[PDB]
Design a protein around this motif. Sequence first.
Motif, PDB file in Angstrom:
ATOM      1  N   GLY C  23       0.949  -1.262   0.025  1.00 36.46           N
ATOM      2  CA  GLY C  23       0.448   0.022   0.036  1.00 36.46           C
ATOM      3  C   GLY C  23       0.657   1.248   0.150  1.00 36.46           C
ATOM      4  N   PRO C  24       0.614   2.551   0.722  1.00 35.04           N
ATOM      5  CA  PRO C  24       1.173   3.227   0.956  1.00 35.04           C
ATOM      6  C   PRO C  24       2.346   3.440   2.019  1.00 35.04           C
ATOM      7  CG  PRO C  24      -0.866   3.409   2.715  1.00 35.04           C
ATOM      8  CD  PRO C  24      -0.815   2.115   1.614  1.00 35.04           C
ATOM      9  N   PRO C  26       6.414   2.238   3.285  1.00 36.32           N
ATOM     10  CA  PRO C  26       7.487   2.263   2.684  1.00 36.32           C
ATOM     11  C   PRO C  26       7.455   0.769   3.044  1.00 36.32           C
ATOM     12  CG  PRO C  26       7.588   4.141   3.949  1.00 36.32           C
ATOM     13  CD  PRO C  26       6.629   4.081   4.340  1.00 36.32           C
ATOM     14  N   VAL C  27       8.519  -0.289   2.463  1.00 34.80           N
ATOM     15  CA  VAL C  27       9.290  -1.508   2.781  1.00 34.80           C
ATOM     16  C   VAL C  27       9.986  -1.342   4.404  1.00 34.80           C
ATOM     17  CG1 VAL C  27       8.779  -2.597   0.728  1.00 34.80           C
ATOM     18  CG2 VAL C  27      10.632  -1.535   1.163  1.00 34.80           C
TER      19      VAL C  27
END
Lengths: 276, 48, 48, 353
Positions: C23-24, C26-27
Motif C-alpha cells: 500500500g502506501p 514503505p517496506v
Amino acid sequence: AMPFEIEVLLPGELSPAETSALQKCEGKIITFSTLRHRASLVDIALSSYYINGAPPDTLSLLEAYRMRFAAVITRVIPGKLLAHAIGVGTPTPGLFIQNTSPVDLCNGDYICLLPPVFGSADSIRLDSVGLEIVFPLTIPQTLMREIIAKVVARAVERTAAGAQILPHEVLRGADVICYNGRRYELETNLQHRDGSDAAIRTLVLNLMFSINEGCLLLLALIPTLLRFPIYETISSWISTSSRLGDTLGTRAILRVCVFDGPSTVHPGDRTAVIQV
Amino acid sequence: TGFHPGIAFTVVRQDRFATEQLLYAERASESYFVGQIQVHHHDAIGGV
Amino acid sequence: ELAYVRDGVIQFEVQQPMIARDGPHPVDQPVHNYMVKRIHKRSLSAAF
Amino acid sequence: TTQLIQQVSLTDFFRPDIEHAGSIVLILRHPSDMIGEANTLTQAGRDPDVLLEGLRNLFNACTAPWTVGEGGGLRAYVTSLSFIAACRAEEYTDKQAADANRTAIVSAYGCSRMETRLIRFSECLRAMVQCHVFPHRFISFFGSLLEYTIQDNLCNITAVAKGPQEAARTDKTSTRRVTANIPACVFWDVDKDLHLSADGLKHVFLVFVYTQRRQREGVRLHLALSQLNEQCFGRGIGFLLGRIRAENAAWGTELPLVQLSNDPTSPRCSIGEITGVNWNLARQRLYQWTGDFRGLPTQLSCMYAAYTLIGTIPSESVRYTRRMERFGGYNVPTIWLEGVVWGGTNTWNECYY
C-alpha cells in the motif's frame, strides 16, 4: 572496474572531542589538488587554499573549486578517513551525502558546490595539529545563480555610501530566497555588515570594473545608440569578462535519487546520490 | 449581553470511540492464490 | 574482588519480528536493539 | 544498466493508470516559490497579483484546498507531457492531433472539475509570462514512466531516469519491456525543417516557446529531435522562430568619450584632485551626459525560447513510428521512439537574440 578509494591516515594526539566531531563530519565533500590513493590531513585543510600566503576570499574559492577534484567522505573509523572520488569515472556504489545548506533538497535536484558566501561556515577545528577544514555548501542548481546575484548586488548598495543612493529606503527590503515553500531571510536576524563584505569585495570589484566597461565600450563604438587605443580595449574587455564568467557559471556534480524514503532532504540530513 | 434574538439552534457534534471487534468466518469462505517471490535491489544510504 | 571494580556492566541484544504489507507504507526492515546496564554498590554493617 | 527513481505524489495532474508506460513525466516546483520571484522580477507598471490570483484559483478546485501550504509533505508533484500539452491545445499547428489528445484527456480523466482544471492551469501558465516567472524554471524532466501503484487519490511512481530505455524490465501486460512515446502534437524534428535530415546520432531536447504581447501571452512546449548539439541548437531555433523573436523584441517591453580625450583642452580632473572641497564643483565642470537606460529591451522582455537536453538516440538511423493508439476510451495519435538513452544535468538555455 573498481572505485577510487582514498585513505586519509589521521595522526594520533587528536583530542577525544575532535574525534567525535570528525565522526559526524562524514558525507561532506572535500577536494584535493592532485588525486592519489593515499592523502594526508594537510591536503584537505584550509591552509591548502592560501593563495598569496593569505587565506582565500570568495573569488579565489570559486576559482579553486574548479581546478581541484572533489571527493565524498565515506565511513570513518578511529584510525583513518575513507573518501571516494566524484568526477572521474568511478562506480561508487553507496555514495550518500549529507545536506550542509540552509535549504531543503527535493528528490531530483542537481547539486553544485558553492563556497560559504553568506554568514558563517561550518568548520571543524583540529587544534591538536594546528589546522582547520571548511566544507562547501550543497545547494540546488536552480538557486546557484539567484544566490550569488543576490549576495553580490546587496554588497554594492552598502558600497553606495556618500548619498550616491538613498540609504534611508525601507520600501524594498527582505531579500529572501524562496525554495521548496520556505522563506530564508538573508540578514540572519543580526548584522554581519563587517566580516562578510571584506571577504567578498574582490568579486564585487571585478564585477564593477567589468559591467562598467561594457556599457561604455558600446557607447564609445556607437555614439548614436541613445591616445586611447580602442581595439586594445575591445580585446581587454572580452578577455576579462569571458575569463571571469566561467568561474561563476558552474555545473552540477551529483543528483538526489531517493528510494524507500522521504522526498525532501532537510538541512543537516542524509540522502543518497548518483553521479552526473 | 444576554439577549435572546428570537432564534434557536440545534447543535450537532460527532465523537469517536475505540471498540473491540469480534469477527466470525465460515470454513473455506475465501479462495487464495500465491505467486512467486522475486528480488530487486537498489542502493541506499550506506549500502545495497 | 568486588572492592576492586570500577563498574560492572551487563549487555542485552533483542530482535523484533516484522510483517510484510503493501500500500502506501514503505517496506519494513528488521530492527536490532543493543542495551547496557550498570551494577550499583551497597554495603552492610553490624557491630558488637 | 539503467537508473530508477521513485516518487510519491497526488493524482491531480497525472493519472498513471491511464498514461502509457514509457511516457515522459515532468516534475513541478512548489507553487509558493513563484510568488517571491513574481514580486521582484515583474516589470514596472504591471500588476504582480494576476499571477497570484490565477494561482490561488487553480489550486482552489484541484484537490483539498487546505494543506496547499508550506510543510504538508504531500503535493501535486508530477505531471505528464500529455496534460501540459492538452491544456494549451490551441497553439500547435496540427490542430487535429492537438484536439484529439485534448478531448482524450478531458473525458478519460475524472471529469469532475477536469475542464476547469485544464482551463485554470492554462491561465496560470499564461499569467506566469507577463510576470517574467518563466515556466522553464518551475517544470523539469523527471523520467519516463515505468511502474506505478495507486490508491484513492494517492499514487507512487517509478521511472527511468538515466540509461537506455529498453533495458528497464517491468511487469507490463504483454511483454516485460517498454519503449518511449509522446503525443504527436508536441513532436518537432528540426532536421526536416532545416534540410539537414542526415543519418546519424541525434539529441532529444525539451524546448519551451514563449510569445509575449500585452495580455496576449502564449506558451507551448515541444520535444525536439535534432542533429545540432546543445550549443548550436539555439541558432536552428531562432531561424525557425523568426516571427516570435521580432514580435517579442518590440511588443514585449511595453557620449563622445573617445573624442573628448583627444585634446588636453577639454575640462578634466585627475584622480589625485578628488578631495573634499573639489566635490561640489566637479559634477559641473566636466561634460554633462543625461539620459537613462530605462525602458529598453532586456533579456526577459525579448526571450522567446528555452530548451534542455534530456537524452540521445545513438543509432545509424533514427527509426520513429507514428501510429494511432488509444488512451482507452479515445483514439489519439502517438509517436514511438526507439532506442533513446536518457541524459540530463537539467541545464536550461534561454534564447533572446
